[PDB]
Amino acid sequence: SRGEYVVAKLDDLVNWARRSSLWPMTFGLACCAVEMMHMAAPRYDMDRFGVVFRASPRQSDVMIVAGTLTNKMAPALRKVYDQMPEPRYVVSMGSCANGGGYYHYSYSVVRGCDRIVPVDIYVPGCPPTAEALLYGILQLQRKIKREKRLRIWYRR
Amino acid sequence: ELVQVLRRGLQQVSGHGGLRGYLRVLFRANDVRVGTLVGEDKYGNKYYEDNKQFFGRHRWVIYTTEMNGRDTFWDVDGSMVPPEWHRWLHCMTDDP
Amino acid sequence: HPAAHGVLRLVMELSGEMVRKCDPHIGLLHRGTEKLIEYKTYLQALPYFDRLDYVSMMCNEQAYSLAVEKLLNIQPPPRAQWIRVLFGEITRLLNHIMAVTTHALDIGAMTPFFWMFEEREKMFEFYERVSGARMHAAYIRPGGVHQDLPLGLLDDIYEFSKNFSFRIDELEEMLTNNRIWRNRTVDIGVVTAEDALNYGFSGVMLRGSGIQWDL
Amino acid sequence: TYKFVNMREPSMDMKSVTDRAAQTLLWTELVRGLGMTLSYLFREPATINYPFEKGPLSPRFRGEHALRRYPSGEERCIACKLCEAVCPAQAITIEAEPRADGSRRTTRYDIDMTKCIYCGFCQEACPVDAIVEGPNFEFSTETHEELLYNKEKLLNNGDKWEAEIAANIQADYLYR
Amino acid sequence: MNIMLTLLTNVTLASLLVLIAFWLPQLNAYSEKTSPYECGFDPMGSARLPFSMKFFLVAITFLLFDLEIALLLPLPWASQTNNLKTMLTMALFLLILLAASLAYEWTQKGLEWAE
Amino acid sequence: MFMINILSLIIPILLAVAFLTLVERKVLGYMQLRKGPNVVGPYGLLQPIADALKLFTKEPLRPATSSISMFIIAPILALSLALTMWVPLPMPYPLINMNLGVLFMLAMSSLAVYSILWSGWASNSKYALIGALRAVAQTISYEVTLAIILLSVLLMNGSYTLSTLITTQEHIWMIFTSWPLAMMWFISTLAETNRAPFDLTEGESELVSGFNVEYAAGPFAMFFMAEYANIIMMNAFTAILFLGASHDPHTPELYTINFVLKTLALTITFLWIRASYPRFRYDQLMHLLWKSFLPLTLALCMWHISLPIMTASIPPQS
Amino acid sequence: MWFEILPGIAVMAACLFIPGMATAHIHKFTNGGKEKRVAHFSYQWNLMERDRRISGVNRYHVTKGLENID
C-alpha cells in the first residue's frame, strides 16, 4: 500500500529527528551528577551526538535522574517531569535512582524513582561511569528508533 | 606544508578501498582514519591500532554489519565486543 | 536550577533584584546516613564516607579511618601513610578544579571547565587503577590501604604532575586579570575574621580573611 | 609557613601609569584571553570515537557480577554466605542445602543490582573466588526487573565472561 | 508599496510557523503540565506583584537624553549650510549642555542604583 | 518578480541561521578541546535539520496563568522584525532603497525589544519577568550611545543612505578613520543583540531561561531564529559600516563575496568572544555604558563634527 | 580537527551569497540588464517618468538614442 509506505517513511523521519536532537534537563541530585558532568567533558563530548543540556523543563526532552531521590525532593522531581512537553523520556542513572541503592532502607529515601515517574532506561552502577551513561543514552536513541506512532495511527 | 596534508587526505580515501569504502566508514563510524589491522573477530568485527595517536584513540574496532541475527549496519553498540577483544580494546592488557 | 549546585531550595526575599533575605532550605539530599551507619559494622560503614562529599572521596575515607584507628589504638604503616597523603593531595586537586570551574561556570565563564575536566579525567584514571573505581574507591581503610599500588602507577602520576602547572597557568590567564571576572568577584561576599571564626567557618573561608590556620 | 595572594602594590611612575591607561582603554588583557581561546582552537581535541574507541580500564575495575567455576565445570561457590554477611547494601540473598551428591551448594543466589553499590567487598570476602565483579559495564536495561539477578543469570555471566575474568585475576591476584 | 509587501510577507511567514507549531504535534495538556515554573516548587506569590525599579532615575533621564539624539540627527545636513560658524557653535553648544547634564547627574549621585 | 526577490532574501537567511547554530557549537567545542556535533550527518551537517524537525514536532505549551494574545504575538513579532531588518542592506544592491536606511534600522531594532518585554510579561512567571526587566535596563544602557556613535560615524558619509557607504569607503576602510568609535560600536552591538558577555535576558546560569523560560517547541524555535538572524544582521551592518568592500558595477558578485566573508569574520568573532569571558552584571553594564562610553562618545561626536569643517572635508550630499 | 568546522562555514557562506547575487540578477532582469535606476530625489524621479513617457512602450529602461531626431 502507498499509504503504509508513506506513514513508514514519515515515521522514520520523525524518529530520526527526535533521537538525533535529545536535550536533557540540567538536573543533578548527587554523586551520579558528577559522572554526568564527565559525559559532557571533552573526553566523551555528549554534544557531538546532538545531546545538549538546557535548564528549562519546557525546552527539554530527557530527564536524567542522577542521584538519590529523597521524600522531600520527590514532589519537585515529579513537578519538573510534568512540565516537560511531550514526547519526553526519563533515564534512571545509578543505584539510588534505580532502586534506592545504599539508602534503600532509609526513612527519607524513595526506593526507586520509578515509583514517581515512568522510566525508559535503567543505568546500573554507583556511580555508572560516563561511558556506561553514554551507552544508556545510545540505547535510548535505539529505543526511540523503534517507535512507530504513525504506523499505529494508520492501522487504527 | 598544506599540500602534504592534502596528500595525506587523498591517501586516506585511497587507503579505505576506494571512494565507496571511504564513504561507508565515514557514515558508519564518523571516522576515516587508517590503522594497522590487529585482528578480526569470529563475529566479523575488525580491530585496528595506531600507536601514534594519543592514548584513547590508538585502538579501535570497526563493528560487523551482521551480528547473531540482527542488522548492525547502523545499530551498533559496545556490547557486541567479545570478552577477549573487550580486554584488549579497553587497554586492560597490551597483548591481543 | 543550574546555579543551585545540587538539590538546594533557596528561598529569597527580593526588592527588585536586591536580596533582602536568604533562607536556604536543605534536606533534599538527607538520606539518613548516620542511622544507617549505626546499623553497619565499621568496615561496612566506610563506603558512606565516599558518598558524603562526592568530590573529595579519599579525604572523607581518611578522616573516618583516622577516627577508627585512634579508637583502636593501632598505627598504619609508613608506606600506607605516604600513599594516603599522596592521594589526599590528588583529591584536593580534584576538588579545587571542580570548585573553581563550577564557580566560573555560574559566573558565566564556561570555557575553563572543559579544559580542567580532562585533567580530572586523568586523575579519575589514577583512582581506578589503584582501586577499580574512578570515584567511590573505598581504598583508605581503618588499617591502612586496601591494596598496594600497581607496578607502574608512580611513573604515570609523575607524568601527569609535571604538566599540570601549565593548565593552572592557562586557567589563571583566563580568569585572574580579567576585569569582568574581578568585577564579578572583588568585594563580593566580604566576611570579617571575627565573623568567620564565630560562625564556624573553616578552610579557605578563614584564610581569605587573613586568619592563619591550616590543620 | 604562608604566602600572600593579594598583597602587592602598583607602581606609580608615569611609564606604569601609561601602561595601565593603555590596558584600560585598549583592552589588552581581554585580547590575552582571546589569544588563549584561539590557541586552544588549534589543538587536537581530547574526544574519543565511542563506541568504536573506549576509555582505558584496569584489571581491578569493578563491573557486573559473575559466579565462577573450577576448571572441571563444578561451581566454586560453597554457600559460606560471607558475601551476604559483608555486603553493606544487603544486596545478596542466599539459600543453600545439601546437593543430591551431598555437596554444599546454593539453591538461591540473588544480587539486587539496584541495591548494589559496586564496592567489591564481596569478592574480597569470598574465600574461593566464587563471586567476582567482572569487567563489563554496558548492561543498561529497559525495565527494573531485568536488574534483579538470580543464580542462573550470574552463572550465565560467569560462563560468558570467564575468559576475560581469569585473565584479569591472573594480572591482579599477587596484589591481593 | 514594496515595503508593505515585505512586511506582510514576513508577518505571514512568522504566523504560519506559529500555526504549524500549534497544529502539527499531539497535545496532551493537563493542569500539572501548564502550572507556572519556579524550579519544582509552587510559587509563593503572584508574578503580577510590584517589582521595584532601582534604576528609576536613569530611566527618567534616558527619556530626556533620547530626545537629544533627535536634535542631533539632522547634523549631517546642517554641515551643508553657508553659516558654518553659526552651525558649529550651535552643534557644540547642544553637546556641551548634554555633557553638563550628565556631569550634574553623575556628581549628585544620580547614576547610582537605589539599595 | 519582487516576490521572488523577497523569498530569495528570506529563505537563505533562515538557512544561514540554521547552520550558524551548527557553527557555534563546533567553534565553541573546538575552543573547549572537544569536537561538537559530528555524528548527525557528515561533520554534523544535518544537525540543524534534526533540531528544527524536533522542535516543530514537539508539544507547544500555553501557560495557565499567561496572557495568550501577547504570549503568541511576541515570537511572531521577533521573527518578522528580524527578517525585516535585512531589506535595506546593500549587498551591493538593496532590496529596498531608502533615503534614511540607518534610521530605519535604528527604529526597527528599537521595536524588536518589545518582543522580549511582552514575552516575559505575558508568561506571567517570575523568571520571565526578571528577564524582561533586564531587557528594559539593557536598552536604557545602550540606546543613546549607539545612536550617537552612528551619527558620529555617518558624518563622513553625508547621508543616512546605506549604499552611499560603499562610495565613501572606495579607497580606505572607515575603521582607519574612526577605530575608537568602532570599538564602542562593536561592544554596543554585543549588548544590543543580547550576546555574551552581555546576555542578561536569558541569564542561563542566573535565571534558568530568563524571558522565554515558559516557551517550548516552535515558539521557542522562533525566538532562537530571531536572535541568530539578528547576530548575522548586526555583523553585516558593521561590515558595511566600517570595512567597505570595493564595488564593480559590472561584477557585483565580487562585492557580494567580499561582504559575506567580512560578515562571517565578525560573526565568528562574536562566537569567539562568547567562549572567552564571564558574564557582566547588568548594573555594571549600565555603568560601563553611561560612565565610560557616553562621555567618550560625546567628545568624539564633537570631534567628528568639527574635523570636516576644520580640514574642509565635508561630504557631498545635501 | 579544527578544519572540520569549515564545512558548516562553507554552507553558511553559500547561503549568505544568495541574497545579494539574486537581487543583482533580478535588478538586471527587470531593468533591461543596464542596472536599476536610483531615485533618491524628485529630479531623478522626473527623469525616470520622462523616460517612461518617451519610451513609446511605457518602460523607463528602454532608451531612445539619436535615432529619434529624424
Ligand SMILES: CCCCCCCCCCCCCCCCC[C@@H](O)O[C@H](CO[C@H](O)CCCCCCCCCCCCCCC)COP(=O)(O)OCC[N+](C)(C)C
Ligand atoms: C521542501 C521540504 C519541506 C520539508 C523539509 C524537511 C527537511 C527535509 C528532510 C530531511 C531529512 C534528513 C534526515 C534523514 C537523515 C538520515 C540519516 C541516516 O544516517 O539515518 C539512518 C537511518 O535513516 C532513517 O531510518 C531514515 C531517515 C530518513 C527517512 C525518510 C525521510 C524522508 C524525507 C521526506 C521529507 C517530507 C517532508 C514532509 C513535510 C512537507 C541511520 O543512522 P543512525 O542509526 O541514526 O546512526 C547512528 C550513529 N552511528 C551510525 C554512528 C552509529
Ligand SMILES: CCCCCCCCCCCCCCCCC[C@@H](O)O[C@H](CO[C@H](O)CCCCCCCCCCCCCCC)COP(=O)(O)OCC[N+](C)(C)C
Ligand atoms: C513553511 C511555512 C509555510 C507552510 C506551507 C503549508 C501550510 C500548512 C498549514 C498549517 C497547519 C498544519 C497542520 C497539519 C495537521 C492538520 C491539523 C488540522 O488542520 O486537521 C484537523 C482538521 O479536522 C477537524 O477535525 C475538522 C474537520 C472538518 C470540520 C471543518 C472543516 C471543513 C472543511 C471540509 C472538508 C471536507 C472535504 C474538503 C475537500 C477540499 C484538526 O485535527 P486536530 O486533532 O484538532 O489537530 C491535531 C492534528 N494532529 C492530530 C495531527 C496532531
Ligand SMILES: CCCCCCCC/C=C\CCCCCCCC(=O)O[C@H](COC(=O)CCCCCCC/C=C/CCCCCCCC)COP(=O)(O)OCCN
Ligand atoms: C588627534 C585627535 C584624535 C582623537 C582621539 C583619538 C584617540 C582616542 C584614544 C582612546 C580611545 C579608546 C576607545 C575605547 C573605548 C572604551 C575604553 C574603556 O575604558 O572601556 C573600558 C571597558 O570596556 C571593555 O573592556 C569592554 C568589555 C567587554 C569586552 C567584550 C569583548 C572585547 C572586545 C573584543 C575585540 C573588539 C573589536 C572591536 C572592533 C570590531 C570592528 C568593527 C572601561 O571599563 P573599566 O576597565 O572597568 O574602567 C572604567 C571604570 N573604572
Ligand SMILES: C=C(C)[C@H]1Cc2c(ccc3c2O[C@@H]2COc4cc(OC)c(OC)cc4[C@@H]2C3=O)O1
Ligand atoms: C553544563 C555543563 C557543561 C556541566 C555542568 C553541569 C552539568 C550537569 C548538571 C550540573 C552542572 O553544574 C551545576 C553547577 O555545579 C554543580 C555541582 C554539583 O556537585 C558538585 C552538582 O551535583 C548535583 C550539580 C551542579 C550543577 C548541575 O546540576 O554539565
Ligand code: SF4
Ligand atoms: S548511586 Fe552511588 S554515586 Fe550515584 S548518587 Fe547514589 S550513592 Fe552517589
Ligand code: SF4
Ligand atoms: S559489590 Fe558491594 S554492594 Fe554489590 S553485592 Fe558486592 S558487597 Fe554487596
Ligand code: SF4
Ligand atoms: S560466593 Fe563466595 S562468599 Fe559468597 S557464599 Fe559463595 S563461597 Fe561464600
